[PDB]
Design a protein around this ligand. Structure first.
Ligand SMILES: NCCCCNCc1ccc(-c2ccccc2)c(Cl)c1
Ligand SMILES: NCCCCNCc1ccc(-c2ccccc2)c(Cl)c1
Length: 326
């Protein structure tokens, strides 16, 4: 069968902690008052959620209310426990309350308000420095949650809120987040298609925090190259082919050989043969002002098939690409 794997960092953080920290099914939820909050407007719509801007009428402070379609109670408890565990961590969205609607029998999470600036207008005003600045803020969030034994598993631009006026960044939507336990086999149906790590696509279940580092690499490539998304798969199988068109098929076979992975038969007629591309091939007139040798070197160390060969969040923070940031 497949060769086992474990995280190179924070491997045993949950092993050395008591069950109260990671056994989310045993966590006791305590509701606040739904009457403290007045809904203002709809911000977005998720698979099993609706996000609203609200006002806490007891202090006249704006908040964010995430109403959850309670399709799986276990999943709601997981998200609540993780949010409670990470509360106060750098650039982590702050869970301020948990409320219930008794008539519809619906739970809601109340968060600190983040004034998100428009992402489409944020493009082409962003400089090389801004990308390095905001990439560093995301790394602080990831190094923190990984150090807390938690994998986000849904890193993408939709899950990163930026208040550009105050240079404030928050990593949000911890609904797919999970406790890392060495040796555990996780569900590969996590992250959004374009941000899915090769481990998920080849059905390698013993993954870790390094999955978030791949997703972060997809975001960096799309920002510096002005190509959204960077890896444009039309399905989960085609997503690996899009990756293989860049990283090449040679290294892909080295990765599946190292972990003794069996490729799904669906990859037989679509994978083909692809040479390893130079990152400099993606440089064009519209993006060259955001690209540098240090950005390319950093990108090359995140976008690796081998999850163990990717920079951890702390190693990434020490990369020359971030020498210009505080
Ligand atoms: N006269 C009472 C004024 C406050 C009314 N409360 C508004 C309110 C009602 C329900 C909810 C709610 C909706 C879905 C799930 C969980 C909670 C909220 Cl956030 C707010
Ligand atoms: N679901 C709420 C919508 C949030 C939109 N996110 C805006 C955003 C803007 C820029 C970025 C960004 C900045 C620097 C480097 C890479 C990415 C992100 Cl992650 C996110």
């Amino acid at each position: 069968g497949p060769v086992p794997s474990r995280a190179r960092v924070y491997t045993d953080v949950n092993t050395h902690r008591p069950s109260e920290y990671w056994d989310y099914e045993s966590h006791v939820v305590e509701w606040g008052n739904q009457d403290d909050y007045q809904l203002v407007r709809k911000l977005g719509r998720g698979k099993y959620s609706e996000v609203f801007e609200a006002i806490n009428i007891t202090n006249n402070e704006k908040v964010v209310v995430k109403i959850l379609k309670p399709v799986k109670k276990k999943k709601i408890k997981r998200e609540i426990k993780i949010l409670e565990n990470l509360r106060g961590g750098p650039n982590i969205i702050t869970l301020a309350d948990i409320v219930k609607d008794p008539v519809s029998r619906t739970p809601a999470l109340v968060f600190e308000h983040v004034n998100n600036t428009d992402f489409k207008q944020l493009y082409q005003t962003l400089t090389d420095y801004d990308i390095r600045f905001y990439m560093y803020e995301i790394l602080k969030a990831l190094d923190y949650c990984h150090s807390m034994g938690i994998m986000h598993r849904d890193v993408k631009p939709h899950n990163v809120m930026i208040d550009h006026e105050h240079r404030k960044l928050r990593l949000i939507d911890w609904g797919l987040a999970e406790f890392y336990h060495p040796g555990q086999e996780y569900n590969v149906r996590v992250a959004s298609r374009y941000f899915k790590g090769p481990e998920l696509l080849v059905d390698y279940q013993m993954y870790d925090y390094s999955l978030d580092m791949w997703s972060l690499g997809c975001m960096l490539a799309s920002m510096i190259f002005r190509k959204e998304p960077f890896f444009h798969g039309h399905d989960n199988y085609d997503q690996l082919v899009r990756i293989a068109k860049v990283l090449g098929t040679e290294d892909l076979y080295d990765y599946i050989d190292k972990y003794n992975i069996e490729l799904d038969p669906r990859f037989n007629d679509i994978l083909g043969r692809h040479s390893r591309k130079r990152w400099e091939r993606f440089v064009h007139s519209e993006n060259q002002h955001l690209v540098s040798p240090e950005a390319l070197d950093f990108l090359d160390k995140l976008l690796r098939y081998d999850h163990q060969s990717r920079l951890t969040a702390r190693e990434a923070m020490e990369h020359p690409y971030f020498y210009t940031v505080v």
